[PDB]
Amino acid sequence: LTVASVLVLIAATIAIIALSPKCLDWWQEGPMYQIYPRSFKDSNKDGNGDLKGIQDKLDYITALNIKTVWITSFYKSSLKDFRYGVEDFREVDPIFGTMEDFENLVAAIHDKGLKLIIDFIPNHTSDKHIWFQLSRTRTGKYTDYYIWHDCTHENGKTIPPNNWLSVYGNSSWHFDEVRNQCYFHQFMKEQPDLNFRNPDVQEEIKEILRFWLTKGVDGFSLDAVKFLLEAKHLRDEIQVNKTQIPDTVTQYSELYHDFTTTQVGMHDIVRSFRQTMDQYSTEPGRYRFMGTEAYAESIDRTVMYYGLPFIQEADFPFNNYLSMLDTVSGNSVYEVITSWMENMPEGKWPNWMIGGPDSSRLTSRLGNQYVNVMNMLLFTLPGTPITYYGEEIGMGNIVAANLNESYDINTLRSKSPMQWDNSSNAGFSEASNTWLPTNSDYHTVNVDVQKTQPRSALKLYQDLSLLHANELLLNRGWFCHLRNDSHYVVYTRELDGIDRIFIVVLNFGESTLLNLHNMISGLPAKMRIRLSTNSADKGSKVDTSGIFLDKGEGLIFEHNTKNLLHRQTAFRDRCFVSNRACYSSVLNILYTSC
Amino acid sequence: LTVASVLVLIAATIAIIALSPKCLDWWQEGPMYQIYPRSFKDSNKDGNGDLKGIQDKLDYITALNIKTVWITSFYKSSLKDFRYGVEDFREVDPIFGTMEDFENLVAAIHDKGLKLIIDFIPNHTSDKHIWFQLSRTRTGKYTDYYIWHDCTHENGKTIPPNNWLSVYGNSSWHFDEVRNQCYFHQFMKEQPDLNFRNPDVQEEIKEILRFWLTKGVDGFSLDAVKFLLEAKHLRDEIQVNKTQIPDTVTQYSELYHDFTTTQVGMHDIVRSFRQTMDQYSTEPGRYRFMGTEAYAESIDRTVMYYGLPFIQEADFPFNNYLSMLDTVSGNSVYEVITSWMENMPEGKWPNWMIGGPDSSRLTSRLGNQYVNVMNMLLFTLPGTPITYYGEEIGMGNIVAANLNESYDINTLRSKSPMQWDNSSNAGFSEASNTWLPTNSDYHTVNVDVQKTQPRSALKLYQDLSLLHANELLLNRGWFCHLRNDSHYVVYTRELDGIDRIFIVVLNFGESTLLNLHNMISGLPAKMRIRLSTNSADKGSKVDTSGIFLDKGEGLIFEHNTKNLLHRQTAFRDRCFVSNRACYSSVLNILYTSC
Amino acid sequence: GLISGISIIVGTIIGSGIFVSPKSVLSNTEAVGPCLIIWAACGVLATLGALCFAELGTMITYLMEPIPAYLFSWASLIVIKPTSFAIICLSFSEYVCAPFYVGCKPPQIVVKCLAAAAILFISTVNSLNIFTAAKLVIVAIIIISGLVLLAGAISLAFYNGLWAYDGWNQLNYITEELRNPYRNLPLAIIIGIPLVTACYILMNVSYFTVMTATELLQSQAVAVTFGDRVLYPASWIVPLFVAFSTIGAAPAPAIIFYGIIATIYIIPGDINSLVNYFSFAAWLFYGLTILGLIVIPVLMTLISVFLVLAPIYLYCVLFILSGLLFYF
Amino acid sequence: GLISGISIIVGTIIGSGIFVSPKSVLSNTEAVGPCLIIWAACGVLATLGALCFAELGTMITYLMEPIPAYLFSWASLIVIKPTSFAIICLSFSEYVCAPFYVGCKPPQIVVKCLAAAAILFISTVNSLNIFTAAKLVIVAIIIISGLVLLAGAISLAFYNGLWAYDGWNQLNYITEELRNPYRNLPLAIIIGIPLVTACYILMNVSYFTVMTATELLQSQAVAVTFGDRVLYPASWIVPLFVAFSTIGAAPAPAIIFYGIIATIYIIPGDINSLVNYFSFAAWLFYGLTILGLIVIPVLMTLISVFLVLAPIYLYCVLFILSGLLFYF
Numbered sequence A, B: 001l002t003v004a005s006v007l008v009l010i011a012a013t014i015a016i017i018a019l020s021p022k023c024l025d026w027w028q029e030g031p032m033y034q035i036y037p038r039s040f041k042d043s044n045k046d047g048n049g050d051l052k053g054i055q056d057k058l059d060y061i062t063a064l065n066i067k068t069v070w071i072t073s074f075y076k077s078s079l080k081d082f083r084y085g086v087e088d089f090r091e092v093d094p095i096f097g098t099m100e101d102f103e104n105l106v107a108a109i110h111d112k113g114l115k116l117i118i119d120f121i122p123n124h125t126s127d128k129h130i131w132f133q134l135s136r137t138r139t140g141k142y143t144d145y146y147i148w149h150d151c152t153h154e155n156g157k158t159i160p161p162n163n164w165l166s167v168y169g170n171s172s173w174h175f176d177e178v179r180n181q182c183y184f185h186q187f188m189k190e191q192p193d194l195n196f197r198n199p200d201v202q203e204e205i206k207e208i209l210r211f212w213l214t215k216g217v218d219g220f221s222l223d224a225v226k227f228l229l230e231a232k233h234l235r236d237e238i239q240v241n242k243t244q245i246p247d248t249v250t251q252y253s254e255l256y257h258d259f260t261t262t263q264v265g266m267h268d269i270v271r272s273f274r275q276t277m278d279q280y281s282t283e284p285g286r287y288r289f290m291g292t293e294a295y296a297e298s299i300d301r302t303v304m305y306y307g308l309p310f311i312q313e314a315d316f317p318f319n320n321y322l323s324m325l326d327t328v329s330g331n332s333v334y335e336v337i338t339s340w341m342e343n344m345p346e347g348k349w350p351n352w353m354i355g356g357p358d359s360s361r362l363t364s365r366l367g368n369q370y371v372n373v374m375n376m377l378l379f380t381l382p383g384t385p386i387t388y389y390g391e392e393i394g395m396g397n398i399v400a401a402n403l404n405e406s407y408d409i410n411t412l413r414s415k416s417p418m419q420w421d422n423s424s425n426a427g428f429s430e431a432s433n434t435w436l437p438t439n440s441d442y443h444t445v446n447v448d449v450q451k452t453q454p455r456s457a458l459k460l461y462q463d464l465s466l467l468h469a470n471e472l473l474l475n476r477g478w479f480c481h482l483r484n485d486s487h488y489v490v491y492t493r494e495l496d497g498i499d500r501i502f503i504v505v506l507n508f509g510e511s512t513l514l515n516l517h518n519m520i521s522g523l524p525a526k527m528r529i530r531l532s533t534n535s536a537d538k539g540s541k542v543d544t545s546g547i548f549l550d551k552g553e554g555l556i557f558e559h560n561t562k563n564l565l566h567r568q569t570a571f572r573d574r575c576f577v578s579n580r581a582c583y584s585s586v587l588n589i590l591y592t593s594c
Numbered sequence C, D: 001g002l003i004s005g006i007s008i009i010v011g012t013i014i015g016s017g018i019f020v021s022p023k024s025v026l027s028n029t030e031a032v033g034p035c036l037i038i039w040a041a042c043g044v045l046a047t048l049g050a051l052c053f054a055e056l057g058t059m060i061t062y063l064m065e066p067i068p069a070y071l072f073s074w075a076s077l078i079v080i081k082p083t084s085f086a087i088i089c090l091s092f093s094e095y096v097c098a099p100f101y102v103g104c105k106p107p108q109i110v111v112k113c114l115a116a117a118a119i120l121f122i123s124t125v126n127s128l129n130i131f132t133a134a135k136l137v138i139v140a141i142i143i144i145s146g147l148v149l150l151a152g153a154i155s156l157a158f159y160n161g162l163w164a165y166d167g168w169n170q171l172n173y174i175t176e177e178l179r180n181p182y183r184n185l186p187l188a189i190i191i192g193i194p195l196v197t198a199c200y201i202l203m204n205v206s207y208f209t210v211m212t213a214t215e216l217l218q219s220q221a222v223a224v225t226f227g228d229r230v231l232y233p234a235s236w237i238v239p240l241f242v243a244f245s246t247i248g249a250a251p252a253p254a255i256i257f258y259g260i261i262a263t264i265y266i267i268p269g270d271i272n273s274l275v276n277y278f279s280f281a282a283w284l285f286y287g288l289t290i291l292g293l294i295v296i297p298v299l300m301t302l303i304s305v306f307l308v309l310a311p312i313y314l315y316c317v318l319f320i321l322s323g324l325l326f327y328f
């Protein structure tokens, strides 16, 4: 009998190994907390943030159950704004410390189990770059590193070869008196676009990627992908106003950009970036993440960066939606969620971010009442929640100050220093005359004040990430949204074998009442709440038919049943899942077939 | 001692297996002989060629050392010309036999060691197709199988949504009175373009590919790849003449086609075609070939179909060059060869074809004197030589006849029936009033006459394919071209370890004399000829300094030396190879390292 | 009892010759029907031969027949045991390096040094049941998997077809210690060898339903090509089991002498030039053994004279017609 | 002579405990320097113990020591031999299924049934040199490849560090038939065990130069992660050799009783809860053995009392001090 029982065990183990799904990578589980390196924490007492200040506050990052950091671009740049025109990719600016300060930051990050991500701008460079200074003199192989074209430039004014306009001004062809030819920049006067059609240039970007990968940056995040390649035929773009007179079109909005954005072969360059990073992802635990971050485009063009089922391009593109939305309601939020889940290919991992560097703050664009409900929506979605720095608490925008450095007046309100304490400059730096004035109402909004008091908008961010990390329904579960409303958004998170669902209700309306008996069938007379967007009514009792919800109010209901909506014939076109799996309570393991 | 000698043998075998390169596939070695199914051979005595007639003449195909057939599109088509508008992809027309006649043809081909290739047109369909007849009535899933757009069509004429013109006429948007909407065809009034943005349509093409792959067609050959996808934004194309008045542009030449050719995502559809055929290529000897056949475009766009080093797209695109060349000289032929070898990525297999269906004959475009020299150029190049039917001998064009069927007046001169015998209709068919009049001078030009007489332009095609198949220098060897001339084209074929090179000299001039001591260094006082395009003179003696060459004259010189040009520092930028390998005379095996 | 004897008989008959024979037996018949007919004829011939040996070996217990005995002793030391020892190693070499060369056939240099290394290895191991179990698995898999998808020149076909039936002349030597040979040894042969014959026929039809007749000629190892056209995901188990069992089927001075002169047999001869070289001398002495018993029969004699006069090489007449005539 | 005895001593000392111990010995010391110091202390302690056993075993030839003897006999049948038999099988289970779960740790259900299947397999095989050769290859490869890229809580570190030195108490039992034990057995220990100690130190520094200190905690199998970060193309040879040699290192009523009660030891205890469970009772009787000799020793006694009073396990005193005292 034992001789049969010994193989029945080996057959059981080989079945578990064959039925166990692939474990979620570090970029799939755990939220991200995007940090601005200049407005997070200062250590050397100079006025600007540094990489050492992020290492000192590393214990606070783990307190929020954060997995990845995604530090914003920190390079030796002559232009700190406008897509971060870099003049030296291998070196770091005098600010943010030195190369040794960066090596100590990534090492301390790996000791606490965290992951790092750095921004990468392969599209353009700076005017002070060693490649551009050697291109104007036609020195060696660098003579064709940029898009150069012969243009006429007489006594008074330059004439571009075409009407191609830059995103931040006029005349995206500028003339220089050294090379006597116009160069294509498309972003700014001091940001020449790096010609990617040169096989030498495409290989030079590989050396920059491998340089940081050996340091252990644990992935990259491309900034401008759709501006890489342009049309070889320097033809004029189609104007939006056909009757418009030429010599007047100077705005990037009044022009159809069909020859300077998303050209043939642009994705193949993105496909080659993943192939280079794949050489460093051979380790079982050391996987490399790659983000495209293509903003200001339609939904069908964003989902193309996910790749094809037979060729890998990128893990996921950064979800620009939910950030440009100024006025939120039941229909605007529902349209954004369905636009991403319906256009994304199946088996991919979505993502969501409420705010970012080039966007207004949450409480300044939506309001202080929507800070709690938007944080729950970020953690109750199947995608990887991405959080901006200072977004876990309610940090308002600041007025535009006149800085001597070349910085964008707009989109600078989000670069305010992090409010740590209630001391001078909100504890961001012990020095005076900081690079940006700290927000005025920092004595009432800071990490130290919100930690000591209950019912604050800091504990809600803590237990949401804890609920997202501990519970398996939020990590890898189905997403079944219920119809469409203008005063409430309700969706259900479920998984096979759990015998328990999560009902998330977000108001986004005007203090209306919800009847849960009209949306989901089979709910009991009383249901319990888990977290709320108020932290004061958790573990309470509410009946389904009639629920009192305020403006900024959100609830999570935990019901025990084996009547999952994803199994019913009605909820088949409104249920999405990335990794379809089945849970087993008896044998605590993950199953593919069930 | 023996205990050490036994492992020294195993170490030798495991070294040979590890150093042996990959064997050349069936599409890399052996020439192709493209056959027109309607003008090759008739069996049932009806007037038109059939697939049974190709089976009867299969022994002649093997007599030319031909590896692949590449039969031109033979489907149930309502339009036999203009990109072969098919109305039924699963069935065969009444002509060319039935489905059983095709199954007996592919089976007889595999018995003689030959390979088959069929043409595939996934771009468009016919008006009588079951998909188009079901699309005009909006019946089920077929309502969006074609590019439909709402257009105005009042009493007198239709108005297209844009100025997109077809390749063969005006107004590539036509109106139908059933669906009351304009459909996009881009080729002809009865050739609606199949909308590929529909996931259902892209999957329906997979079922057509798998249908013929189970029959054993041994690969496909796509017809129109650059016309698959179009721009979703129905915007007007840029006119070549800016001052041109609208309502007059009706020619495909006076319009820049930037929204209807080579769109974003077109290659991804081609990448998916190879992924479907890869499921049938798992066998070691049963590999599937895929050709794109993108004509009328630049060289940088043609080489993009070769694929990337990390994703396979196609084996090689069909080389449209060397066919549109009407006047041949030393510079026109040299530019074509260098344009393909310099733009093609390394490790790929090139190709060459002198003529085709949509092109004039060789002796009618170049002359009867250039028939022998162009056949040597096809077999002395590293690519896969592709030969049109009737091209091995000198077959002239015919005058344009008025046929009752919808056929193109031009490009029909190449569809003349094959001249087999000197009997009625040149032995093509025993019936009268054939579909196309056989060329008049068939009593002097036929396979039977050229076989019995020596010094003909049929034996030169036989021993060229024999020399290309027997000798390894022509199968897989280096290609080092010498400088540039207007009255002779000289290149050298060599391989490491052979200790012997092949010097090919083609005149393409006006009966000039060549001094071989000025081009290649190290040649002896006397050199022998191998084929000498003109016959007879083979195995003769000619000194290097002074060689008498006629207009249509070509020679192959075989010199024994270990002074390969590809090893010298001067001939480093003019030497190309696909599979770099070294030969060993002592041990008759292929080596990678040497 | 009886089933044990049948299993023992089947075990010593099914050797490493069923997946090497079809390639050489189809190159002579050039068909499928005649190929199966020749295989059935070879099977019934081996059956009759074993049935006759079962009555000739249990009545005289070299032992069955002076000069003839000396010739048999001399032939079994050069052209019988060492030649069959090299064919098994050549079959193992052409099957262990076959998956490495998918598109094209392996080089002749690689297969010879690998076969010579296999000879020196087992000759050293032997100088100091698992093979049978794994061998019957491939024969069972090919037959079973073949059924789920189903429902001058004449003398060389016999030479290649009878190589698969290798061991029918040494059945009474390992079956006289089981039970009474009264009605057990002849009974285990009249239904044991035809069972292998039907097993070989069911295994040969499994090749013709997957690959066509013309593909069998250009295929040195017919089993490795059948393993990738049917069992595509698991295709390495066929070239591994048939090679792991072949090396098992293949006295210090006797092994060294059998491994030294066997290496000089693969240098000037291929795998096809040795089968007709071993089966010539083997069947020459087989006919003398049947002739010695005489000194069904009307057909056994007319078919045996044809098997000898049809082939009637230069390196063979100086060994059997010149070697002993200088000694005698 | 002497070198043969040294090789035999080294062979029975270097077991499957050098690549399982560091993970548990660093989780208690939480450093690198103290870790190597604890390893050197364990090595010198094993050296002194073997040197004392070399003088205690060759003068009284259970054999080294009434009631105490009975207790030793009773303990060696339940908590000594069967427990150590389960730890070896648990170490084999956590190493043969480790490469399958790269990103995350294996399930507890899978490792227990696989360990129980390994117990029933070897218990059946035993009821009816290649491992050592392949084991020394991995130790040599990791050390060599590590050099080409180089140029309360204190008691648990000793428990996990001394598990690698498993076999130092049974050296005189298999070394008294080689030569004179006058100056050969103590000589092959004073330079044989420290040679393994230096071998273990050179093997541990090979891990800290490839992976950092924090990566060693979240790595059940530290050798499989070292095999892919250095030998990326050939990374399957490390998890295969250390698993093929571990299963080799692991009387009908004695084997059945040792395999039945060992299965119930892996259900409520992990691989970490059993090392401190076996080393507690083992070193408890080791101290009584040294104390019996007194009634090197000055250090063996002061270090043994510390190993017992520092943890002071509750589920152990009711099995060895309560189980048999009710039976006796």
Ligand SMILES: *[C@@H]1O[C@H](CO)[C@@H](O)[C@H](O)[C@H]1NC(C)=O
Binding pocket: A241, A242, A243, A244, A245
């Ligand atoms: C832009 O379009 C509008 C037509 O709606 C019209 O003002 C004109 O065509 C364009 N504007 C100018 C200033 O030309």
Ligand SMILES: *[C@@H]1O[C@H](CO)[C@@H](O)[C@H](O)[C@H]1NC(C)=O
Binding pocket: B168, B169, B170, B250, B251
């Ligand atoms: C355009 O339409 C008219 C009407 O049929 C036709 O005669 C003409 O041929 C078309 N133009 C071309 C280039 O075919």
Ligand SMILES: *[C@@H]1O[C@H](CO)[C@@H](O)[C@H](O)[C@H]1NC(C)=O
Binding pocket: B241, B242, B243, B244, B245
């Ligand atoms: C086409 O271009 C030429 C200018 O070279 C001029 O004839 C005109 O702009 C265009 N022709 C017509 C008929 O408009």
Ligand SMILES: *[C@@H]1O[C@H](CO)[C@@H](O)[C@H](O)[C@H]1NC(C)=O
Binding pocket: B331, B484, B485, B486
């Ligand atoms: C060779 O090519 C160059 C440019 O294509 C041309 O200028 C030159 O005349 C050519 N030389 C000969 C001998 O044709």
Ligand SMILES: [Ca+2]
Binding pocket: A123, A193, A194, A195, A196, A227, A228, A229, A230
């Ligand atoms: Ca660019």
Ligand SMILES: [Ca+2]
Binding pocket: B123, B124, B193, B194, B195, B196, B227, B228, B229, B230
């Ligand atoms: Ca189309």
